[PDB]
Design a protein around this ligand. Structure first.
Ligand SMILES: Nc1ncnc2c1ncn2[C@@H]1O[C@H](COP(=O)(O)OP(=O)(O)OP(=O)(O)O)[C@@H](O)[C@H]1O
Ligand SMILES: Nc1ncnc2c1ncn2[C@@H]1O[C@H](COP(=O)(O)OP(=O)(O)OP(=O)(O)O)[C@@H](O)[C@H]1O
Ligand SMILES: [Mg+2]
Ligand SMILES: [Mg+2]
Ligand SMILES: [Mg+2]
Lengths: 435, 428
């Protein structure tokens, strides 16, 4: 069994401490550190803890996933190694805790598997590497590099090289990495995999990047818009659906070689996109990224590979047929982001929802007067606007569960009510002298 | 004319060498053309030419009744009306807008009297630049040495009295370094001229003492914000149209209809009376600023409050405006909405005597209690649809308000504030 193999790696690598990882409703990693003597208990009856943290009655159990056992490559003190285990949350009786984000994606994937569907995701993870002043993080870029720039213009080549190496040691396959448009911005794209593996790997990337950045006196951040006037970090999600082993989005006889299932999936996602934005763009800062002038999509449209739209259908066909949903940012909870896209996309397929016409023209160049005539909508401008749209979307509330949906609304409203009352420096700079 | 002869007599007496031809833009900011006293005869006669882009070729028409010597050789002031080169009045001038709305009210025998309570802050200056640090650590109705600004306030009131200004009283307000100067009531035009003069005088005397006076609605987070509570009454043929000794609470039907009209268009009026992005950081619960759309007697802090004094002192206190508003437009908007209430006989909602702030949301839902706009864009969208206020203020003024407010909102919306970095940078 897998448990035997885990104990074999423990003795071989001299593992002494194990981190029982899990994630709250906001995508923040949480854990319980246990000595290796308690590993047998963790894989058996499980370890008890207070699940108040998940919300961000109290007694809950951690159920480690044996497939996620990985040794942390940063060797601990004096040859003693550390290991991690991604855990599912269960109630004391044994039934799964429906408030756990990982359980939510698992449920939505099981409902898709009933209809022979399996969703594969391949995200493009953008992030910034900032300097640290007096031990505290800042928003000052480490390098003054631009798109696909090379060293010495790109100073973060060593750290990025270490990130990709550390990931490959943990059964991770990376496609390519490069410097992005903004100063100190970078991107690491990894290959497609099932939504659950992908979500686990997204959490691991953020953890690894932030850990290795601190080792070099830097701070890695996946914040959507840390600097005004420059490009913001996005999480473009390449998505494809696979029915009975074959790619359900490929039809060689249909026009553009795009199957009917793809058009319905796009139609479903675009129908609930205003509600999905509350999950995929969950911070108040996420809406400072959704502004015109940068690579981020703001208008609700879909097109081919020759236009920067919300959904893009790349040229590659065959097994690589897919859609690139470009609205999410890397601060979203990946477990809930993929669950929301899968539920909206499958409703598209089930109800045969036809998507709008493919806008191939440049949407920013088109006049606002013409957009209303075509029928082109806009994504929510504020977090409150997206939460109000999410609150009404009965499908996403049921797909994510009432517990998770309520927690998202409570956290977002608490942040919005605090942000809206604040007096920002822009207001003093604009009015104090004159008024 | 003899007002002109009177002006030249004061010139020779106080040895006045320069005259300021003051006027105001759509945003209530004072603008002026400095001319030597040799050109004063030309200003009072054919007028002085200037580029009209500032209000958002025109002539300045000084009002001889507004000639005042600046108490700080000697300098003098003249509030001017704007006209186009041919002679017709410029309908984009804020002072001309209030005059037009007052003339329309006068044709129906009505005259509006306003008495504002002007709140403001006095802040320290660091390296010749203004800050939001209170000069004093005082509180409501506080006395020296807790109130360190009693000498500046003393000078403000004094200087104002030297320019034909009657001040009712002055006191320290709730927040640190906040003060209030309430002056007697007068017709909407004289009051709006007086409001502009106060702001000019207070900011000038504050600089003389190395301080900075500001009429910003919410310069500091977590403390009280500055408001402009406007005491308003309507007069019909010399008598107070709001007093009826036989009616309940001794309030006339005209008061209830005027209140009904103001409350009907209050969401649109907020774009004029609360015109800055910062104005909506003041319209938050927990401070003396009204947020819910209600009207009540003197025992409750509501949007409209009907004080106990009766007879000729019958009035309503509209507490939603802030002192950063253009007074010429703020009074014109209130007069037009209030007169539509009187005209169309619009009944106001039931007076809410309970403490709204303590009431549950589900309760307010039953009472049908509305909320004021939460953002500047939200108020501008409501103002854009209010056909009455757009016609009352004129298409030129209404368009200019919308253009300046959306330019500010589109710049504010895209900005990344420090709060966001403090909240997300370390964790995400
Ligand atoms: N079928 C798919 N479903 C979801 N994502 C995909 C799919 N194919 C590729 N992607 C994602 O798109 C990115 C680039 O696509 P790519 O052109 O490399 O496809 P590929 O040539 O078949 O190689 P790979 O399968 O490793 O992505 C990758 O990071 C990957 O995660
Ligand atoms: N008819 C009115 N309309 C608007 N405001 C008024 C009116 N009467 C008084 N006020 C305001 O009330 C303040 C004084 O309060 P109060 O009304 O109790 O005294 P008053 O004797 O009735 O009026 P005043 O102080 O002007 O002589 C003044 O600053 C004035 O601006
Ligand atoms: Mg891309
Ligand atoms: Mg007060
Ligand atoms: Mg008051």
């Amino acid at each position: 069994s897998k448990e035997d193999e885990i104990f074999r790696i423990v003795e071989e690598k001299n593992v002494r401490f194990v981190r029982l990882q899990f994630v709250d409703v906001q995508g923040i990693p949480k854990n319980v550190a246990i000595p290796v003597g308690q590993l047998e208990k963790a894989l058996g009856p499980g370890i008890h803890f207070d699940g108040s943290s998940i919300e961000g009655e109290s007694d809950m159990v951690l159920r480690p996933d044996p497939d996620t056992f990985r040794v942390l490559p940063w060797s601990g003190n004096e040859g003693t190694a550390e290991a991690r285990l991604i855990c599912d949350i269960e109630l004391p009786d044994g039934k799964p805790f429906m408030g756990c984000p990982r359980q939510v994606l698992k449920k939505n994937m099981e409902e898709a598997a009933k209809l022979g569907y399996v969703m594969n995701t391949g995200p493009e993870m953008e992030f910034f590497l900032f300097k640290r002043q007096d031990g505290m993080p800042t928003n000052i870029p480490q390098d003054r590099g631009g798109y696909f720039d090379l060293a010495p213009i790109d100073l973060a080549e060593e750290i990025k090289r270490e990130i990709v190496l550390v990931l490959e040691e943990m059964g991770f396959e990376v496609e390519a990495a490069h410097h992005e448009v903004a100063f100190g911005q970078h991107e690491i794209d990894f290959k497609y995999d099932n939504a659950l593996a992908t979500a686990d790997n997204v959490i691991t990337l953020k953890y690894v990047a932030k850990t290795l950045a601190l080792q070099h006196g830097l701070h890695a951040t996946f914040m959507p818009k840390p600097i005004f006037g420059v490009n913001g970090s996005g999480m473009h999600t390449n998505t494809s659906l696979f029915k009975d082993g074959k790619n359900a989005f490929y039809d060689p006889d249909a026009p553009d070689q795009i199957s009917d299932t793809l058009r319905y999936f796009v139609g479903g996602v675009l129908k609930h996109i205003r509600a999905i934005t509350a999950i995929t763009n969950p911070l108040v800062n996420s809406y400072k990224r959704l502004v015109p002038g940068y690579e981020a999509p703001v208008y609700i449209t879909w097109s081919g590979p020759n236009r920067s739209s919300l959904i893009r259908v790349p040229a590659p066909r065959g097994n690589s047929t897919r859609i690139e949903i470009r609205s999410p940012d890397p601060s979203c909870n990946p477990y809930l982001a993929f669950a929301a896209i899968l539920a909206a996309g499958l409703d598209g397929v089930k109800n045969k929802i036809e998507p709008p016409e493919r806008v191939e023209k440049n949407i920013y160049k088109l006049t606002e007067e013409e957009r209303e005539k075509l029928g082109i909508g806009m994504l929510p401008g504020t977090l409150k606007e997206a939460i109000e749209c999410f609150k009404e979307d009965e499908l996403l509330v049921s797909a994510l569960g009432e517990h998770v949906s309520q927690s998202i609304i409570n956290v977002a409203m608490a942040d919005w009510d605090s942000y809206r009352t604040q007096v920002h420096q822009w207001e003093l700079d604009r009015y104090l002298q004159t008024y």
